[PDB]
Design a binder for this molecule. Structure first.
Ligand SMILES: CC(=O)N[C@@H]1[C@@H](O[C@@H]2O[C@@H](C)[C@@H](O)[C@@H](O)[C@@H]2O)[C@H](O[C@@H]2O[C@H](CO)[C@H](O)[C@H](O[C@H]3O[C@H](CO)[C@H](O)[C@H](O)[C@H]3NC(C)=O)[C@H]2O[C@@H]2O[C@@H](C)[C@@H](O)[C@@H](O)[C@@H]2O)[C@@H](CO)O[C@H]1O
Length: 572
């Protein structure tokens, strides 16, 4: 019964995936795609982050036959268990999560098919450093006994004080079915008993189907109604492939034709905009794909990891996400029903998202409206999804607008928590600047942001603390030689091996950094020229900010030219 680790707002969790190389396994070698090693990867994790990071082993393309995944996993669990801090000579077992269920555990899709619950129990009993087990990405192959197996995984985890972590997306009603929509109620009953050992996450890979907002809505509602211990999200740069995009801002769709160029192209900073929707809504668990771009290769951090993910995750440790109690206080509307019966992701389009195919929000006015599926009992206005208020886009806004007041101006995403305004430009692949006006009591702040830019503005006793991130390297080189979508589509494949090699040779080193680009901050109601203090950020990525003080108009324009992360205080 005693939990093997804490997972909550004060103890968030960053999953650190390591994918087995099946080809090398057949040759009797135990290696991961991308050249990370279990020991090397752990060692390279910053020490301040080690208490909040867990290695997630994934069986990837291990042989699809009995014994392959057990063999590889036992080998790795041994390595984790016997690790010695280099250093202090102490045996310090590396915490691990095993991926045990994926692709419906179909024998034609995954070696994970041949990991029995009996075997998992044995592993939990042998390895105290095994902290949880992971199911991921079954929406597209919703196997006959998936709910029965999920109940078994939750129970075996609870039996051992571990966590069952499930990353899933509401495609084909997956989240609704999980809890009993179609009559498979084993997991519903398991959760009644064992929800304290459950973590539920979204998995935003299938971006063409547009279920980001409804899945995240459920994740948050399930948490608030005690149907999961904590929640979070797996954010996946493959969304760029799923939606058929190519060169940044280029016109034309290439569909699903250049996978390995496409998962490299999502702007680095956009992952932080996605991760804000988790943080701002009380979520505390984070995971990413494709691992080579989002984390790195060869036991080294990629620039996406170092400049965006690591900074962001350090931020949510230093400033714990809002507690359940606080999210629950702030919630004005809680939806009960199946989004699959109301157009799915379309439910929120032109309410708080700008389109079907996006992982971002266009306003923070309602934050994320929480919901649970209609199969669950209840158990703040709790509203049936079939209410007249939800019948249309306009009904939704009118009803919501009475309970959630407008608290900023401008066509841009912004949400406030205590003394802090969180802002981002919500454009995905369109080069449009956005502006907003935010207030901290009597201090008025305007911002102008280009796409793929987020900021956190905190009112402090003597001024304003600013953290900015617009890190976005230039990916055009991947799309060289293609003057349009037709030509792009016909490029020679980068391939998986080729994309790992591109990261090694052109991203880890010889990086094509993006151009510096302008952010404006305008303060109004100001007496004196403010001064800048504690200025730091990504090495070689910013000019000294320029200020223009208009004394008569009690305003100052701050102009920033940068491409990276940045922080400073303004005193006034
Ligand atoms: C019909 C079909 O082939 N299935 C698609 C899924 O993935 C494939 O099938 C499973 C069984 C695996 O064999 C996987 O390797 C296949 O690609 C899709 O799931 C993810 O989809 C993206 C595309 O959006 C990728 O295929 C991704 O896998 C690739 O990247 C990961 C790292 O991010 C690994 O490097 C994989 O080896 C690589 N695959 C290939 C062929 O290069 C898929 O993610 C993987 O598989 C899923 C099921 C899950 O286990 C993840 O944790 C894992 O990373 C799905 C997308 O909606 O579409 C299916 O049609």
């Amino acid at each position: 019964v005693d939990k093997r680790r804490e997972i909550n707002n004060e103890h968030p969790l960053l999953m650190m995936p390591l994918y087995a190389n099946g080809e090398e396994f057949n040759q009797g070698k135990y290696t991961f795609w991308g050249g990370d090693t279990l020991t090397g990867k752990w060692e390279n994790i910053p020490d301040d982050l080690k208490p909040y990071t867990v290695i997630q082993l994934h069986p990837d393309d291990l042989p699809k036959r009995d014994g392959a995944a057990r063999d590889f996993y036992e080998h790795m669990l041994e390595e984790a268990a016997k690790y010695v801090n280099p250093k202090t000579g102490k045996n310090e077992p590396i915490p691990v999560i095993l991926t045990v269920y994926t692709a419906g555990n179909m024998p034609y899709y995954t070696s994970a098919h041949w990991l029995s619950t009996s075997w998992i129990d044995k592993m939990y009993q042998k390895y105290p450093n095994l902290h949880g087990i992971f199911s991921t990405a079954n929406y597209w192959i919703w196997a006959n006994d998936i709910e029965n197996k999920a109940a078994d995984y939750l129970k075996v985890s609870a039996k051992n004080g571990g966590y069952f972590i499930w990353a899933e997306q509401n495609n084909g009603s997956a989240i609704e079915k999980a809890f009993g929509k179609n009559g498979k109620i084993a997991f519903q009953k398991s959760v009644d008993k064992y929800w304290k050992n459950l973590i539920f996450m979204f998995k935003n890979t299938p971006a063409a189907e547009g279920n980001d907002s409804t899945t995240e809505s459920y994740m948050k509602g399930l948490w608030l109604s005690n149907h999961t211990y904590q929640w979070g999200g797996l954010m996946d740069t493959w969304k760029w492939y799923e939606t058929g995009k190519w060169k940044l801002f280029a016109s034309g769709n290439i569909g699903k034709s250049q996978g390995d160029r496409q998962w490299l192209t999502e702007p680095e900073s956009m992952l932080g905009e996605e991760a804000l929707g988790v943080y701002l809504n009380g979520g505390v668990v984070y995971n990413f794909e494709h691992p080579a771009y989002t984390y790195g290769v060869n036991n080294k951090e990629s620039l996406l990891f170092s400049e965006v993910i690591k900074e962001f995750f350090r931020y949510v440790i230093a400033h714990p996400a809002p507690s359940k109690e606080k999210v629950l206080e702030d919630t004005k509307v809680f939806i009960h029903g199946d989004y699959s019966n109301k157009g799915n992701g379309k439910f929120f389009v032109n309410v708080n998202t700008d389109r079907e195919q996006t992982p971002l929000y266009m306003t923070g006015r309602y934050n994320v409206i929480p919901a649970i599926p209609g199969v669950l009992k209840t158990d703040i206005q709790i509203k049936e999804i079939t209410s007249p208020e939800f019948s249309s886009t306009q009904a939704r806004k009118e009803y919501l607008n009475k309970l959630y007041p407008m608290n900023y101006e401008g066509d841009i995403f912004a949400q406030k928590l205590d003394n802090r305004w969180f802002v981002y430009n919500y454009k995905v692949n369109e080069n449009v600047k956005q502006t907003g006006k935010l207030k901290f009591n009597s201090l008025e702040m305007n911002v102008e942001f280009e796409p793929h830019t987020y900021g956190i503005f905190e009112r402090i006793s003597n001024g304003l603390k600013v953290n900015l991130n617009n890190f976005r390297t230039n990916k055009d080189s991947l799309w060289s030689n293609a003057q349009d979508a037709n030509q792009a589509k016909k490029l020679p494949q980068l391939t998986k091996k080729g994309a790992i090699k591109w990261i090694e040779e052109h991203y880890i080193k010889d990086t094509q950094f993006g151009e510096k680009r302008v952010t404006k901050i305008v303060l109004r109601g100001i007496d004196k020229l403010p001064t800048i203090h504690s200025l730091s950020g990504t090495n070689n990525s910013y000019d000294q900010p320029s200020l223009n003080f208009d004394q008569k108009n009690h305003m100052v324009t701050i102009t920033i030219n940068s491409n990276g992360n940045l922080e400073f205080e303004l005193h006034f």
